[PDB]
Design a protein around this motif. Sequence first.
Motif, PDB file in Angstrom:
ATOM      1  N   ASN A 124       0.854  -1.185   0.000  1.00 51.42           N
ATOM      2  CA  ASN A 124       0.000   0.000   0.000  1.00 51.42           C
ATOM      3  C   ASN A 124       0.895   1.243   0.000  1.00 51.42           C
ATOM      4  OD1 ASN A 124      -1.841   2.127   0.406  1.00 51.42           O
ATOM      5  ND2 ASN A 124      -2.880   1.212   2.120  1.00 51.42           N
ATOM      6  N   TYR A 137       4.356   1.982   1.816  1.00 55.08           N
ATOM      7  CA  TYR A 137       4.278   0.949   2.832  1.00 55.08           C
ATOM      8  C   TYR A 137       4.082  -0.457   2.222  1.00 55.08           C
ATOM      9  CZ  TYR A 137       3.598   4.565   6.591  1.00 55.08           C
ATOM     10  OH  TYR A 137       3.737   5.576   7.552  1.00 55.08           O
ATOM     11  N   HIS A 186       9.267  11.000   9.038  1.00 52.67           N
ATOM     12  CA  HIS A 186       9.019   9.568   9.137  1.00 52.67           C
ATOM     13  C   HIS A 186      10.009   8.939  10.112  1.00 52.67           C
ATOM     14  CE1 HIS A 186       6.046   7.505   6.541  1.00 52.67           C
ATOM     15  NE2 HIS A 186       6.333   6.545   7.421  1.00 52.67           N
ATOM     16  N   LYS A 235       9.297   9.927  13.866  1.00 55.91           N
ATOM     17  CA  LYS A 235       8.148   9.155  14.323  1.00 55.91           C
ATOM     18  C   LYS A 235       8.504   7.922  15.133  1.00 55.91           C
ATOM     19  CE  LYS A 235       3.522   8.042  12.657  1.00 55.91           C
ATOM     20  NZ  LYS A 235       2.969   7.945  14.040  1.00 55.91           N
ATOM     21  N   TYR A 236       9.659   7.282  14.858  1.00 55.71           N
ATOM     22  CA  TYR A 236      10.032   6.048  15.563  1.00 55.71           C
ATOM     23  C   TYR A 236      11.129   6.222  16.595  1.00 55.71           C
ATOM     24  CZ  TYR A 236       7.806   4.611  11.147  1.00 55.71           C
ATOM     25  OH  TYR A 236       7.016   4.514  10.031  1.00 55.71           O
ATOM     26  N   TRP A 239      -2.136   6.405   1.801  1.00 47.01           N
ATOM     27  CA  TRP A 239      -2.390   4.984   2.055  1.00 47.01           C
ATOM     28  C   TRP A 239      -3.831   4.765   2.517  1.00 47.01           C
ATOM     29  CZ3 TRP A 239      -4.007   3.300   6.784  1.00 47.01           C
ATOM     30  CH2 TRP A 239      -3.690   4.070   7.913  1.00 47.01           C
ATOM     31  N   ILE A 245      -6.948   2.855   0.427  1.00 44.72           N
ATOM     32  CA  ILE A 245      -7.841   1.845   1.005  1.00 44.72           C
ATOM     33  C   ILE A 245      -9.283   2.183   0.647  1.00 44.72           C
ATOM     34  CG2 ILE A 245      -8.818   0.947   3.183  1.00 44.72           C
ATOM     35  CD1 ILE A 245      -5.759   1.082   4.118  1.00 44.72           C
ATOM     36  N   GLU A 257      -5.309  -2.886  -0.726  1.00 42.80           N
ATOM     37  CA  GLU A 257      -5.837  -3.771   0.306  1.00 42.80           C
ATOM     38  C   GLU A 257      -7.325  -4.135   0.154  1.00 42.80           C
ATOM     39  OE1 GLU A 257      -4.198  -3.299   4.561  1.00 42.80           O
ATOM     40  OE2 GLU A 257      -3.403  -1.477   3.618  1.00 42.80           O
ATOM     41  N   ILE A 294     -11.052  -2.786   8.184  1.00 43.63           N
ATOM     42  CA  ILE A 294      -9.906  -3.525   7.651  1.00 43.63           C
ATOM     43  C   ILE A 294      -8.953  -3.963   8.789  1.00 43.63           C
ATOM     44  CG2 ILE A 294      -8.744  -1.267   7.110  1.00 43.63           C
ATOM     45  CD1 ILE A 294      -8.038  -3.042   4.278  1.00 43.63           C
ATOM     46  N   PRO A 295      -8.294  -5.162   8.735  1.00 39.63           N
ATOM     47  CA  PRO A 295      -7.329  -5.502   9.791  1.00 39.63           C
ATOM     48  C   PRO A 295      -6.154  -4.525   9.681  1.00 39.63           C
ATOM     49  CG  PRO A 295      -7.831  -7.414   8.415  1.00 39.63           C
ATOM     50  CD  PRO A 295      -8.285  -6.197   7.683  1.00 39.63           C
ATOM     51  N   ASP A 296      -5.760  -3.966  10.814  1.00 39.90           N
ATOM     52  CA  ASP A 296      -4.685  -3.006  10.888  1.00 39.90           C
ATOM     53  C   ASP A 296      -3.383  -3.701  10.600  1.00 39.90           C
ATOM     54  OD1 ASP A 296      -2.467  -1.608  12.728  1.00 39.90           O
ATOM     55  OD2 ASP A 296      -3.969  -0.107  12.190  1.00 39.90           O
ATOM     56  N   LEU A 297      -2.464  -2.975   9.949  1.00 43.95           N
ATOM     57  CA  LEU A 297      -1.094  -3.375   9.600  1.00 43.95           C
ATOM     58  C   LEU A 297      -0.311  -4.025  10.800  1.00 43.95           C
ATOM     59  CD1 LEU A 297       0.932  -1.369   7.117  1.00 43.95           C
ATOM     60  CD2 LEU A 297       2.134  -2.192   9.115  1.00 43.95           C
ATOM     61  N   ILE A 316      -9.272  -1.767  12.197  1.00 40.64           N
ATOM     62  CA  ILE A 316      -9.501  -0.323  12.135  1.00 40.64           C
ATOM     63  C   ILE A 316     -10.651   0.005  11.175  1.00 40.64           C
ATOM     64  CG2 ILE A 316      -7.231   0.462  13.022  1.00 40.64           C
ATOM     65  CD1 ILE A 316      -6.785   1.392   9.899  1.00 40.64           C
ATOM     66  N   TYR A 356      -2.758  10.142  12.243  1.00 44.93           N
ATOM     67  CA  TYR A 356      -3.266  10.478  10.904  1.00 44.93           C
ATOM     68  C   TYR A 356      -4.513  11.287  11.109  1.00 44.93           C
ATOM     69  CZ  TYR A 356      -0.253   6.540  11.043  1.00 44.93           C
ATOM     70  OH  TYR A 356       0.808   5.728  11.377  1.00 44.93           O
TER      71      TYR A 356
HETATM   72  S1  LIG Z   1       2.846   5.605   8.956  1.00 42.38           S
HETATM   73  O1  LIG Z   1       1.591   6.094   8.537  1.00 42.38           O
HETATM   74  O2  LIG Z   1       3.584   6.376   9.878  1.00 42.38           O
HETATM   75  C1  LIG Z   1       2.716   3.983   9.509  1.00 42.38           C
HETATM   76  C2  LIG Z   1       3.924   3.538  10.031  1.00 42.38           C
HETATM   77  C3  LIG Z   1       4.062   2.211  10.394  1.00 42.38           C
HETATM   78  C4  LIG Z   1       3.002   1.344  10.265  1.00 42.38           C
HETATM   79  C5  LIG Z   1       1.784   1.794   9.780  1.00 42.38           C
HETATM   80  C6  LIG Z   1       1.604   3.128   9.398  1.00 42.38           C
HETATM   81  C7  LIG Z   1       0.240   3.594   8.956  1.00 42.38           C
HETATM   82  O3  LIG Z   1      -0.665   2.500   8.793  1.00 42.38           O
HETATM   83  C8  LIG Z   1      -0.748   1.859   7.586  1.00 42.38           C
HETATM   84  C9  LIG Z   1       0.005   2.150   6.467  1.00 42.38           C
HETATM   85  C10 LIG Z   1      -0.310   1.570   5.250  1.00 42.38           C
HETATM   86  C11 LIG Z   1      -1.334   0.677   5.135  1.00 42.38           C
HETATM   87  C12 LIG Z   1      -2.108   0.332   6.269  1.00 42.38           C
HETATM   88  N1  LIG Z   1      -3.111  -0.590   6.100  1.00 42.38           N
HETATM   89  C13 LIG Z   1      -3.804  -0.974   7.196  1.00 42.38           C
HETATM   90  N2  LIG Z   1      -4.744  -1.912   7.040  1.00 42.38           N
HETATM   91  N3  LIG Z   1      -3.610  -0.509   8.452  1.00 42.38           N
HETATM   92  C14 LIG Z   1      -2.659   0.409   8.623  1.00 42.38           C
HETATM   93  N4  LIG Z   1      -2.476   0.839   9.884  1.00 42.38           N
HETATM   94  C15 LIG Z   1      -1.810   0.918   7.540  1.00 42.38           C
END
Ligand SMILES: *S(=O)(=O)c1ccccc1COc1cccc2nc(N)nc(N)c12
Lengths: 288, 287
Positions: free
Chosen positions: A62, A65, B90, B93-94, B126, B130, B136, B154-157, B170, B224
């Motif tokens: 996606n 990512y 980015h 963020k971590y 992203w 969706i 996805e 949708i199931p979260d990443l 989510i 977000y």
């Molecule tokens: S970013 O946006 O900072 C980020 C960083 C790490 C992990 C996730 C994310 C944002 O979340 C997602 C990014 C892309 C796709 C996606 N798809 C789903 N289903 N859930 C999430 N949480 C994300």
Amino acid sequence: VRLPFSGFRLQKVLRESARDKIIFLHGKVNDAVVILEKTPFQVEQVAQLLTGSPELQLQFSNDIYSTYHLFPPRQLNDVKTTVVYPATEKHLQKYLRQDLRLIRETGDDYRNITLPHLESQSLSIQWVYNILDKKAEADRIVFENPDPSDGFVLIPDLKWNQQQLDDLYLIAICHRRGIRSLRDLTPEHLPLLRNILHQGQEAILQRYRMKGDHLRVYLHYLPSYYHLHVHFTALGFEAPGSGVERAHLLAEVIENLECDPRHYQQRTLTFALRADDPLLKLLQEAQQ
Amino acid sequence: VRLPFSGFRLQKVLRESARDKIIFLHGKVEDAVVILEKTPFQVEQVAQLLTGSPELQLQFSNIYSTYHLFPPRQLNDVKTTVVYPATEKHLQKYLRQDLRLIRETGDDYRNITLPHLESQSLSIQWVYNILDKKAEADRIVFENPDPSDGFVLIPDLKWNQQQLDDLYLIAICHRRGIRSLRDLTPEHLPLLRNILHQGQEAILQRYRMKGDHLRVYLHYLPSYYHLHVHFTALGFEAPGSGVERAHLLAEVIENLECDPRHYQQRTLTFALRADDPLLKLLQEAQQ
Ligand SMILES: *S(=O)(=O)c1ccccc1COc1cccc2nc(N)nc(N)c12
């Protein structure tokens, strides 16, 4: 090199933490308990591995990512295994993790179901009274406002060793009797709540050199004991109890009372109960 | 299959929690961020292994005894997330930075937070991908296509979907412009009720998981700025389920039903990284 027993037979999964990547297994051997924990990543090995072509399986993509499934070599595949043999019922008792269920209690649910149910039980809180009248833990008192009505006692939690601020955990118990929980709170409790909040934080600052912005100050709905008490924990210290399904910020409790006097008597509170708890069934039965 | 990059070169270890069995790595590939997380144990796959003679290495002994287990390929799964390309914001963020608490009054939001936010925040592409099924689509658990009161579940990443113990779904609303909790008014009640009800009924259908096993919340100061609701397994100590950030959906709805102007006027409490410019801005404003 091998098991201290001949054969395992999983009887029950005691506890598991999906977050901590750990499992606790009770098994009948030849009773033994086996703990399995995934190992933390070793910076070096992981760096080294990623700088070489690995075995990946694209889960999904996606935009910028993308998620994969990595299968690393033997080295990076270590698993921490702890074996408790023999283990009795009391050994299983400490690792017993009950299934939690959520419930939304309205003011009428509290009045009709919860309040009479807790009134039926004789939950003694003598240990609390002993703290308040200095018959116990007098040497541990960090701060005290002795006011019989708006006063409280600030003691550090017994689980806190006091050798570091990283896990700072303190508890304010009010001097006044009869405030069982959040449900008993009305605007008359505002001076007591404001002291616990303000005086408590100023005491932490003086004693432990810890600013208020480093503190999470909350109440528990459906508390372990029914005599009002507030938790002061280091913000960086994460634990079940600080979760949204149970914790209520003191600052917010105060502001709610300043806005709606009848807030905690009328509003619908959300909390978790053990599946085996009779109060859970009672409320479920009442709600249908 | 291959990674999306031309080799890796570790520049800095962003985050490394031994507790959460996770690592955050910054590497020059151009800039890329690689997240590695150990997978939670699958009850059956582990019960299948322990009932067979394994490879153990005794560390210590006393009722207690520690060992080192080396399981087969299946039980050696590692969750790998790759961010390519990745910006400076980015990387920020971590980073493991000290957190500070702040109490933002309605006027603080209007005067300080809202203009800061408006100055710029993350690309949310992203999310859009969706919603418009560009990504996805195969993962969607339920969709209410209503442009206004609709959403996508949708199931979260952060969830591998191999166990219900850490169930993290989510719900993202179809409607654009609801950045956060602060944008919520009674007009959003049908949308919020639709997420609460339809979302829980979708988890029940798909995962056979009752609503009383679920924690349904919003985050104040979200990552977000496009409204999204988290559906987590109650037994899971989910990241951000803490009182300093999470707001239960049921409660958000009831507040709007009681006080229409609640989220525009009331004082919200949240944590910010010590290095965050918004933290200094609010501190400066509050004195
Ligand atoms: S970013 O946006 O900072 C980020 C960083 C790490 C992990 C996730 C994310 C944002 O979340 C997602 C990014 C892309 C796709 C996606 N798809 C789903 N289903 N859930 C999430 N949480 C994300």
